[PDB]
Symmetry: C3
Subunit: 308 residues, 3 copies
């Protein structure tokens, strides 16, 4: 097998999302920019390492890449590569806007092409099964569109960002019903339980992208999106002992994207003088959870229980 | 078996919702305030009686309470208690704002905790079944959130009300698809057919809550919500002979929440000079239907076919 | 059987939608009004011919009409008659507003009654099956409501148009999840693959109706709707070789409604100076695709492969 699973890309993804969330606090806190820079540099280094390892996989492990691409469930994790690429471009935009725009466009085109080629292929039927409805399916159809929308908004293409954001939002609200019904009916295997944290992602990622596109204006839509996001957060907090029933694992980084988007939207709301206490609580909670994830990853690295 | 099914809480629930709907017509009609006061007092008395009966059930019938709480389908009716509590708090707000706030907060916390502890347990799987997808599932995930949002808006917490309203709205949008698909596929047993009236509830309850939070402004969202609510109302009117295939019963009070929310939104739309004729028709239809429900309940009480 | 399938009504439907889209370009081009008039006249003639054929069917083939009405899947195509009637009324509104209003009201009442009588009857269950979830179900529940909303907006009834538009939009959002899940799970049979083009319709029909009701003011909702519409357009472009695996057929006109609504929304967006390049591309693409459909229909007619 390949040492690095494609699902490990959630580490740089979450770190970059948290870096952007901290970047949004540049003015109110002098060390916020330093924290954002540190997080962004760490995320960029991790993303570079993972991209090189995935290139090695393509060159010498193309059979596994083909298997995961053709699988009805594992293909969704390949969408983490363009998402993390767009996030790294967003990070670099504070230093080199040209490289940032190049990376953002590369990631947007890559994720759009991947969704067109694979997510639409499922409509043919026969390969996708009722037990293939996993939370990871948000990554190609939902998370990628929101990330592309936010990145394009960062580049100034606000109308194209609106298009991508709407695509992601409607895909999210069109897929989540069947996903939740399947979770209610057919449970979820322990090895796939860590991916339940992706259920927290779309609700907060949508509001983060919307606030990025519309210059951080807190409309009724953003408040509604936090309503659902906090409902989901409470639901998953009550289920966390069941998610980690078999123990802590690197798969819990799936919560990282949701937590970082929650922190970003929390900064946006705090800037708007709306639900300031709730925003502070959400930001602190997301930061503490991501710090615990980082500590767990460090412990796994030291103990050697990280790579496969 | 306890003489009071947990589903009988829809009587005070609908009566209180209609009382608030009439309260909204205080200025336009001099006896509207008297009608609202009468409805609110009757609803409060019925709610107090039912709360005492349920406390008796807890003290001496805790086995049945546990069975209904752990059931994947019957648990949803326990959410009627916090909803009725919040509605009674809303009623009392016109007399004792402090008691109203206390009841509203108690109900909001209770329903949020119930949804977190039970609606999220279903995701574990193995207990919820495809045949457990019933209209009653709206009560914990949807109706409770809308009622909490409207109550908080009544207290002045408009942003928290927006959060709760969005949670309820997105929960409704996420659950209704599978519910309607199941209804199309697996029919519905006669004993559960009376609960089909809850399908009418979310569309009108959402617009009622939205108009409560945003100071009764008729936005495009309210018009859209009435569009879908009237579509569903026509759909259920065509199905009413099928719903009462085995005769009228106290289960028809499930329509009461939808009718009362329709009346409240009708008052809100009439105040805004938007579709005044349709608003008057909806208000009159809701009042007449709830009066018919009250007459049926009185007939059952006299005949002795009310308690189980 | 009867020579003309009820699904052939998509020809006048698509032609009329494209005629309205071109009519929206009256001022920009001198020949735009002439093109719109030609398209509208051809669509009206085809609709008159098909209505006469369907009247002949009712008088002398009522058994087939009853069979398609009672079928859980074939009934949806009967909604094409009121939809095309409303579109023809919209066309005639430029010449005889009174006849246009009469036709629009007749079509609105007919489609509303059909949905109430049949779409709601499916909730009884036992006749609708998991394999009856086809894209054609959009026609009675979604496309009809959007067309009625747009037609009513054309007549000046903007609030009633908003009601119908919201009904259609929420019906679309409530049905698409299970439809896409079924498509992913079970492959659509080749004879029903041509109807996959109806999946493209709702996303663009919704934005077209919204622009018609709100005076073509490009709002965030319109941009979101284009986002999802273009996502679905790419998805179906990837799938087109699979849709026509067994060859081209008159069933491909199902794409006509989606393409024409895309063209109409393209005119609306170009008017507002929002994504002008994308608007031009969408308009040209829709016009070229509908022209290809027209050429295919002409070739089928010449080769005697059009009627059954």
């Amino acid at each position: 097998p390949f040492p690095l699973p494609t699902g490990y890309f959630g580490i740089p993804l979450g770190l970059a999302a948290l870096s952007l969330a901290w970047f949004h606090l540049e003015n109110l806190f002098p060390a916020a920019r330093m924290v954002s820079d540190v997080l962004g540099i760490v995320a960029s280094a991790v993303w570079i390492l993972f991209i090189l390892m995935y290139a090695y996989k393509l060159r010498y492990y193309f059979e596994e890449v083909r298997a995961e691409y053709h699988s009805p469930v594992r293909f969704s994790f390949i969408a983490l590569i363009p998402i993390t690429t767009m996030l790294v471009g967003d990070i670099l935009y504070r230093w080199n806007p040209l490289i940032a725009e190049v990376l953002i466009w590369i990631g947007t085109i890559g994720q759009l092409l991947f969704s067109t080629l694979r997510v639409s292929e499922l409509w043919q039927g026969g390969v996708f099964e009722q037990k293939s409805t996993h939370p990871s399916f948000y990554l190609p159809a939902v998370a990628a569109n929101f990330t592309s929308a936010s990145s394009l908004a960062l580049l100034g293409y606000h109308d194209l960002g609106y298009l991508f954001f709407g695509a992601g939002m409607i895909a999210w609200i069109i897929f989540e019903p069947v996903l939740l019904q399947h979770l209610r009916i057919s449970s979820l295997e322990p090895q796939f339980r860590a991916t339940m944290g992706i259920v927290l992602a779309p609700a907060f990622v949508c509001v983060s992208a919307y606030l990025s596109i519309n210059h951080g204006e807190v409309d009724t839509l953003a408040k509604i999106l936090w309503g659902y996001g906090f409902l989901q957060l409470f639901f998953l907090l009550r289920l966390f002992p069941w998610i980690v029933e078999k123990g802590l694992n690197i798969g819990l980084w799936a919560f990282s994207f949701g937590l970082a988007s929650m922190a970003n939207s929390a900064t946006a709301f705090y800037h708007g003088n709306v639900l300031q206490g709730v925003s502070i609580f959400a930001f602190v909670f997301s930061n503490v959870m991501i710090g615990l994830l980082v500590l767990m990853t460090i412990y796994k690295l030291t103990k050697g229980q990280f790579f496969l």
